[PDB]
Design an enzyme around this catalytic site. Structure first.
Site, PDB file in Angstrom:
ATOM      1  N   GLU A   1       1.354  -3.605  -5.727  1.00  0.00           N
ATOM      2  CA  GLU A   1       0.186  -4.506  -5.625  1.00  0.00           C
ATOM      3  C   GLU A   1      -1.085  -3.821  -6.119  1.00  0.00           C
ATOM      4  O   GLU A   1      -1.272  -2.638  -5.905  1.00  0.00           O
ATOM      5  CB  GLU A   1       0.033  -4.860  -4.155  1.00  0.00           C
ATOM      6  CG  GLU A   1      -0.953  -5.973  -3.875  1.00  0.00           C
ATOM      7  CD  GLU A   1      -1.047  -6.289  -2.387  1.00  0.00           C
ATOM      8  OE1 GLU A   1      -0.065  -6.179  -1.655  1.00  0.00           O
ATOM      9  OE2 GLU A   1      -2.132  -6.623  -1.914  1.00  0.00           O
TER      10      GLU A   1
ATOM     11  N   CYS B   1       0.934  -1.182   0.000  1.00  0.00           N
ATOM     12  CA  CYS B   1       0.000   0.000   0.000  1.00  0.00           C
ATOM     13  C   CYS B   1       0.942   1.193   0.000  1.00  0.00           C
ATOM     14  O   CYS B   1       2.029   1.146   0.636  1.00  0.00           O
ATOM     15  CB  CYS B   1      -0.898   0.081   1.311  1.00  0.00           C
ATOM     16  SG  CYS B   1      -2.013  -1.403   1.273  1.00  0.00           S
TER      17      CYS B   1
END
Ligand SMILES: O=C(NNS(=O)(=O)c1ccccc1)c1cccc(-c2ccccc2)c1F
Ligand SMILES: [Zn+2]
Length: 272
Positions: A174, A140
């Site tokens: 991601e 993140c």
């Protein structure tokens, strides 16, 4: 009923998403966070008491980057669990898709701060799996609202590829990416690839660019497609651009803000 506003340092910041602070903390008008240890509190009075007592003036873990008043700390989720959980609950306020808040031990966190005589002020961070089966070099990434679109996100994305280069590996963030995250990666990748295309001319293949930048071949190709700089020949994407077209792209307003640059001389890190 959910947390909708926080006070951190000198900033009050509205929430964008639900974050699962304990229910009791949501009931309050604001949640008050210590900007150094990230403890969250329910009252202005417990916050002011904490500000006078707390001895932290920077993140925990190791300062792996320092240049002038910009610093990055590396914080392992196993060594500093509470700090990392607090950071994850803060981040979830601004991230729709983050789903991990408490199980932080598989992660390392890279905390970006801007330093004054009072201490080191959190700007944002990114988390990264210690072992990523999928080759993700960011799990993140979040820049707090008052620092968005001011070059700090660009610094952190660059920083994440600087680690990948030191690991001799390619990496990609991601998915799914946030809205800001997509725009920011697309702009970063374009910038980096265009600047490499400027400096060579140059018999650079896509594989060459991947080894030089740690950007995956796929992210290089999708970027080069968006710039119309690739041709396709019997099943292979191939680079196709003139020195002049490269400069036309780089002359654009997108690439004109002076970047906060990552100075490799100031990065202290080796693969674990
Ligand atoms: O600040 C940002 N980007 N703007 S920037 O000026 O640093 C930049 C980035 C890349 C290229 C050019 C400029 C930025 C970059 C990455 C992630 C976030 C983010 C994602 C979700 C919630 C909160 C924040 C950002 F806000
Ligand atoms: Zn504190």
């Amino acid at each position: 009923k959910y947390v909708d506003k926080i006070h951190i340092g000198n900033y009050e910041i509205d929430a964008w998403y639900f974050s699962p602070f304990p229910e009791d903390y949501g009931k309050q008008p604001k949640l008050w966070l210590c900007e150094y240890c990230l403890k969250y509190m329910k009252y202005e009075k417990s916050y002011r008491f904490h500000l006078g007592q707390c001895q932290w003036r920077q993140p925990p873990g190791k300062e792996i980057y320092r240049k002038s008043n910009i610093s990055v700390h590396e914080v392992d989720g196993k060594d500093h669990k509470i700090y990392c959980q607090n950071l994850c609950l803060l981040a979830k306020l601004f991230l729709d898709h983050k789903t991990l808040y408490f199980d932080v031990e598989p992660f390392v966190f890279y905390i970006l701060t801007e330093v004054d005589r009072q201490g080191a002020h959190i700007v944002g961070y990114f988390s990264k799996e210690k072992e990523s089966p999928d080759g993700n070099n960011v799990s993140c990434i979040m820049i707090l609202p008052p620092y968005q679109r001011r070059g700090y996100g660009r610094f952190l994305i660059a920083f994440s590829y600087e680690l990948s280069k030191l690991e001799s590996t390619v990496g990609s963030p991601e998915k799914p990416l946030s809205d800001l995250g997509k725009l920011s990666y697309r702009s970063y990748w374009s910038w980096v690839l265009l600047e490499n295309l400027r400096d060579f001319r140059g018999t650079l293949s896509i594989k060459d660019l991947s080894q030089m930048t740690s950007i995956t071949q796929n992210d290089i190709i999708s970027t080069l497609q968006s710039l119309n700089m690739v041709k396709y020949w019997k099943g292979q994407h191939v680079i196709c651009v003139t020195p002049k077209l490269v400069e036309e792209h780089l002359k654009s307003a997108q690439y004109k803000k002076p970047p906060i640059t990552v100075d490799s001389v100031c990065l202290k890190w080796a693969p674990p």
